[PDB]
């Protein structure tokens, strides 16, 4: 079963391709409508694979150096194996002298095509956590942020290193301990500093970065005594907040103390930067923070000069291998559009709420430190992804949280996509859900994903994933290829392409051109007869995914703030397929007396009066009460023991909501609305050219028309 | 009026202390004259013309101690301040009342009207020293609060000295005794290669240390709680003073960024102003104000002084503009370029305090000296944002000032602070012949803000007669005041020209003066008023300021010159010519008038080893210190009954003070020593260490009458003077 | 956003208490001391004056004038409430000793209450005329 095949390959190898059968010729390879790409999750979880404390087998070929995999032909009599990538034959290492046909290594069983090795050789480096705290916020917002950072302190390992950088108008780099004085270094938040200057101006562990088991006592007291930025805020003004400088000092500090080692720069902001490099807006309250309308009509002077400052810090720290998180909670915009490259280029998180004193932020912040069964953080550091392909496959590039290492070879394609021009990438921070999109070009077929990273325990590990897909039979080329098409993977992979060109500028024109082309090659129709157009089961969901994509907030940026659009695009470029389909096309369940909860369509026809809805947008859990049930609820039928069934109805969507309200890392905003309610707008905008019926009719007229 | 032949006396120093001359004035005018300690002139009889002044070859000038502590002070609070409508001279006892409702100004001769507010019985006319309550027009801003900022060197060398321990303990003991009301503000700054601020808040568990490492661009890290209210934050300040000497025990910082540290301290006090106390122990080597090292001269280098940079001079002028005064405590063991650092105190009305080779365990003498000097420095009265005008009768003109201040336009002396231990000097000339009047008057008006927030004006008025003959000028000569003015003139000659020129001008001052007296009358003949003139000048030429063939180091000389330019006339004389007594044979010829106390009065001996004796002990009063030299063959009675010791060999090497024994010989010498220090506010430390072999017998370096291998004796000096007088 | 506070006796313009912080002050302290001289018992008990980029505010209670200077954009509503907080405290502590004193700034130590009350207004978290006319 092709459906069974797609599901199993993602559960085992953490991959999902747009095409599972690849063009065996240069003819079809150039004419492929949707490119050959993969939705690869380097650290996907699975039913308890044994951590293989081996040393990965090294191919004797210098250029190749691919890892031993089940696709390699073995000879247990001659003690040799043939590398499936370069045909080079190798001699087994001494520790493999006793491998037999009845006792063979794990890296040759197809069940362990994806596998993780543990390399214990050098002394392990500790994890580093640098808190960067904004002090220009209300007392209730600062107090809750203090308690949350004190909570995360009690969850860190005893060997981890911690540091404190508070900032407002100035930047304070605290020296921990010091016994009875609590000292810190103050800097002007008006001029930037390089890592070399900061090193000379300041002077394994540091005076500023000490282990938790020795410093947690004083740090908890220091965080408990943190107070507002002492500088007054005159009437009609914003506070002088130096975000772009405190970040460059946080980057510069770790850059000269622990380069090339896992470290998290955790920045907490409660407003936009109003001073120094990286400025987002002025200090006068009469000038509103820039909007997309202000972006388009050139009414935003701080955007380009602000983004350039944060792209420089993003590339500085990603080169050093450090992670930047951005926890932004304020009532207005905070400047995420200008700082988006820091958590995007690195593997950093991006939490966005209204205030730090909310259940939304507090619970979301402790999800960051969610541990596994062995009590270890679900995060990896300093990942190095190298991709090795057959001599017939070239790599265009990757679209996701990564940075090019600019490594050249026979696998690099002249046509680059996203972060291309390389076969090696660095992901400073990865989680079990981090998903990359690699685009391949054709010039069995095999691809080997090698992921070297630092585990949250300090152990250096390597995750190897080798996959194989059949070349199309020459006498059944497009026929077999069409059946191996993954519409869900191709939809997100093509969406990953559109959001990239939009965020680095029409894009909707390219979307419709490719949708029509895909219809004209894999659809069934007579020419000039639109009613004769049908799609196979393999393709019958693709146009519906394109419909909700071109009308989504990812491409129709207006009706959102620039920060909200950058936040939506942030989480989309990182999630797996299951969550990505929810973002593009939210799922919707119905709750009524007539039947149990059932999934329903995303159209205005599903809105019934005597029914309760539960729409799951990845960012919003929304419960909608129809007009009849709202009146039945405003009346008071629930409290009466006569209608215990009406209590089941009103709380059935609540129960199902609580489950997915805890597993999802960016805890979605919970909405309880009804007919006539204000927040019912979120339901009516995701629902329903114009409508899908009209959109399909226009598509069929162009599919059966000229090619 | 008699004439003295210095070549036959050789014993002209009186056995009793020297008294200033009484100006040849009317009995009723002299009785109202200013106290000679607050205000005195070199020539009590003013020469009528400049030609007469140049013929006498004696310098004309004034020496004033304006803010000295007084036993009694009349404070007038009149609703109006009577000043002359022309030269703004305050009404003084030396004006002329004619119409009973009109008075003649003694300085500009203009007649004024007496306001409806016996007019000659008014207290403003019966006291030469008085203090007014200035009206609202005499202040540029509301009275500033008392502000104290302490800046401490905390480098590795400074931590080794151990000065921070005693300085912080003295602050805790004298925290309530600091001058000021409930508006008092206090602050702290430490520094090595980086500048350290110290915020103080009651909402925080402890003070917070804020580091400014941007040395080329200092700034203020916090808008509040750096200069905090002492009344509200009393407890928070006491905790920091107990914790400061423990934060830098293991410090490896070797360089000191003094220049940038003072800039941050200036920016901190710039809004309000006040007193800035700076403690430094080594050469400034890092940042702006960096000074190059220098090799010390020996006894074999000739007279071949000036600042190395204008930084600390430019910085003091900015401090003066913001009413900030800088006192420099230098506790260095090596060269520190005090010729450049001293500019921070000379041009800001501050004062420097030098403690050579201070060490908490190795130099207990400097430790107790810093203890007593800080006891005075923190408890003496103080004035803020002050100015002083010096007015003299028409015809006389001030042309050169001496002291620690900034001369504003129109001869206005700027005093960011004014302290009761500062002395000043003024040199003047007869611009217009005084043929009209027979009296001249000098008035100094000191406008300042007290520690209680009150604009006050302290006024001193002096009156002197005018004479027109050479002999009448020499008759009113004040030999102690002439030596004080010549020492200030020679200090400027050193900076301007060289040290040889400063020494030649001092000898020519005695030659030309006595050569002119001889040309208007065999041996060396001098008037009675100048019988000690060659003695005090030879003492000047042997003081550490101008000595030549000695092993003196650079910082010792500049500090000896900073004390010439800043100390009052009395302590300048005590330093230059210490009073030597014999204190092993005290008797009952003393001042036993004061109740039970007897207070022996031994005669003053001359500063010669010939006057000493190995059979007894000799006490020397050098003003700031008291040295008791014990002879080797001293009597067993003085050893056991005064020193509490059984032999000369068991006298402790550094003896910080005498024991109060149960012997009448102890009571006599304790009474005599107590009487010495009661004459001064600065507690003079006594040390009986001077032995005949303690290697600390600089007691002999004060024997100015005797010859050395690098100077003349007093009698050798008189022979050289006579050789040039009748050349 | 910035302050210059003065408390003076209306009869003779005698200063009683003030508070000034810079890090100019010389031109507006002069203009402040003319107002204290021009004011008498026929002056408006509540007034606001325009000085170009600056603006004075004062109230007169018990023959005592409470003047404050600030940049013109400072809320007029807050400047008067600031002077009322000063008057209610000053009249209680020294109100009965005001007509007898004769020294300038006989209540400097009121400096402490001014600055602590001042900080509660320059932190966001009646007649009008030109001052040049009255002078
Ligand atoms: Zn190979
Ligand atoms: Zn006059």
Numbering used by the authors:
A (entry chain A): 3 to 205, 225 to 464, 476 to 537, 541 to 723, 746 to 764
B (entry chain B): 348 to 464, 476 to 662, 666 to 882, 888 to 1093
C (entry chain C): 1 to 23, 29 to 130, 148 to 157
Published text:
The packaging of cargo transmembrane proteins into COPII-coated vesicles entails a direct interaction between COPII protein and cytoplasmically-oriented ER export signals. About a half dozen export signals have been identified to date, almost all comprising short peptide motifs, all of them binding to the Sec24 subunit of the COPII inner coat. The ΦC export signal was identified in studies of p24-family and ERGIC-53 proteins, and comprises a C-terminal signature of a pair of hydrophobic residues or a single terminal valine residue. The ΦC motif contacts a site on Sec24a that is also the binding site for the LxxLE- and DxE-class export motifs.
A series of ΦC-signal peptides was synthesized, based on a core sequence of yeast Emp24p, and individual peptides were soaked at high concentrations into two crystal forms of human COPII protein: one comprising Sec23a/Sec24a•Sec22b, the other Sec24c. For all ΦC sequences, we observed clear evidence for peptide binding to a site on Sec24a in the Sec23a/Sec24a•Sec22b crystals, based on the presence of residual electron density that matches the peptide sequence (this binding site is occluded in the Sec24c crystals). The finding that multiple classes of export motifs bind to a common site is surprising, but the COPII•ΦC crystal structures highlight that the common molecular feature is carboxylate-group recognition by the clustered arginine residues of the B site—the terminal carboxylate group of the ΦC motif adopts a similar position and bonding arrangement to the carboxylate of the glutamate side chains of LxxLE and DxE motifs.
